[PDB]
């Protein structure tokens, strides 16, 4: 029912999804989404590539069961200065101002997400999630999370994360939603076991296979960006180091120096760098899907580098945007060295 229309303008027949928001949107509204940055909206075209079946099932289930009502709660007190956009509204400023108010400013939500320093409310909301996830209500879970529930939260008394619970219950859409808000399939409970483990123990094998795909999402995406293939996780090899183009020539001295510098980063900083490279990959990839889906009109009429994430420093953001300066060969070199060392660091 809800799938027929854009969540942001009511425009018919939408082509993109905002995965973290569980909404389908049209092209125009997407073009504004892409400018907000992944920390606000994570965009993916619905028909251009195959999705993991259960990731798309999750987004479409969420949107058909009141996801948009969390984000538009205030509207549902109706005033003349706060009006939802209509399909024929100009992208600038009509649709844009609305979308930024919907998702960036969180203008229409029932209650804003608690401040990060709010330990007691964060804990309460998080214990609700860690219970709620056992059942199959995705709307409650998105609601809790929007309020500031933490998906990788560790229950001090029960000894487990929401992802453990969903996994032992076979709640795969829940697992999927939680992983979007960065739940970790590799986190051990107090008894030393991963959500992957609870899945297999429960006889939920596709979910187990899916959790492992989620574990390796970052490196899988980097490998695909250069090969058009991903590791075969059922085979047991979990990485895929693409070959460099200059493979017939000896490695140059600055290339060796660059990689030395990269290996020098602590695991924590390295994983931060890889998220950055992940984001740029996702940008360069979406750029091409954009040009492949858009009509000649819309294009010949966003941003040429990663959007600013306000929760990052000006330095972090500068490095992230510096990634757009990389030419194909430079970028491929960074991606290959990040892949071969993600592997090094895990053995």
């Amino acid at each position: 029912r809800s799938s027929d229309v854009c969540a942001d303008c009511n425009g018919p027949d939408p082509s993109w999804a905002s995965v973290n928001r569980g909404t389908f949107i049209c092209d125009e509204c997407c073009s504004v989404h892409r400018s907000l940055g992944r920390h606000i909206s994570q965009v993916r075209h619905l028909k251009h590539t195959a999705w993991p079946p259960t990731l798309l099932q999750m987004v479409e289930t969420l949107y058909n069961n009141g996801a948009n009502s969390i984000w538009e709660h205030s509207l549902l007190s109706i005033m003349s200065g706060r009006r939802k956009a209509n399909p024929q509204d100009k992208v600038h400023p009509n649709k844009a101002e609305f979308i930024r108010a919907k998702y960036q400013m969180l203008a229409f939500v029932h209650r804003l997400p608690c401040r990060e320093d709010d330990s007691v409310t964060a804990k309460d909301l998080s214990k609700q999630l860690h219970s709620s996830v056992r059942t199959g209500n995705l709307e409650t879970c998105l609601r809790l999370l929007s309020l500031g529930a933490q998906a990788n939260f560790f229950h001090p008394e029960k000894g487990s994360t929401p992802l453990h619970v969903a996994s032992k219950a076979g709640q795969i859409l829940q697992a999927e939603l939680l992983a979007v808000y960065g739940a970790d399939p590799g986190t051990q409970d107090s008894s030393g076991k991963t959500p992957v483990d609870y899945a297999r123990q429960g006889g939920h094998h596709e979910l187990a296979e899916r959790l492992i795909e989620i574990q390796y999402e970052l490196t899988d995406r980097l490998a695909f960006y250069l090969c058009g293939r991903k590791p075969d996780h059922k085979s047991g090899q979990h990485f895929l180091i693409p070959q460099r183009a200059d493979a017939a020539l000896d490695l140059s001295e600055l290339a060796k120096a660059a990689k030395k510098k990269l290996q020098s980063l602590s695991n924590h900083l390295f994983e931060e760098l890889a998220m950055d490279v992940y984001d740029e990959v996702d940008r360069r990839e979406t750029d091409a899907v954009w040009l492949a889906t858009q009509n000649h009109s819309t294009l010949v009429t966003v941003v040429p580098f990663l959007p600013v994430n306000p929760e990052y420093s000006s330095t972090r953001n500068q490095g992230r945007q510096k990634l757009a300066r990389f030419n194909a060969h430079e970028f491929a070199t960074l991606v290959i060295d990040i892949l071969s060392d993600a592997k090094r660091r895990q053995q």
Partner: peptide
């Protein structure tokens, strides 16, 4: 954060 971010930024500059 800044001491962490500055390490990342210098790795990135090494690849460009």
């Amino acid at each position: 954060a800044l001491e962490e971010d500055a390490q990342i930024l210098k790795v990135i500059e090494a690849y460009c």
